[PDB]
Amino acid sequence: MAFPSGKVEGCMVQVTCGTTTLNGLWLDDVVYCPRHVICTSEDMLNPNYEDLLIRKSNHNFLVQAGNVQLRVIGHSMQNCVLKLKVDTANPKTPKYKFVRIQPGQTFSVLACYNGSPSGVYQCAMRPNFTIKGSFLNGSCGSVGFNIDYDCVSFCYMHHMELPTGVHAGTDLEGNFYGPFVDRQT
């Protein structure tokens, strides 16, 4: 059994940088997404993220909530997450907190594609910090959460599928669960 997803659906956006696109989480006036978005196809194998960050300006990020483009007015990098400051606060921001979970704990995942919610299901973090999720291409940036009364606890942001078909990602401060790095190897 997963938690009802309504409170999280209203926070999902699409983030595009050049030709690279994925999902972002829009809370108050900040959009959180995997920093992998600043890679072109050539960069994805061995990215130098500090150097790519320097090359990008605010107007190189295209953030879309449905059909509405949001203006990016600042950007910063925190571990493996990018934080995009936008000029509009999300009117559907629920009460929320960020938390880091442990192996054995379960959470709900809202799988999204190109900024649009697609399905909801429950996962468990395995002892080696991977999860056996149900994720296809385009799902990078999908989030996992629990509901604690009126409060949404965001605990997981999806980054990558590993060669054996399990999945790996970060907490909402950009720190990986497990000994992984955000590169296409």
Partner: peptide, 9 residues
Amino acid sequence: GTDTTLEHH
């Protein structure tokens, strides 16, 4: 020096 990566919607 400006990034010239083509944007695709």
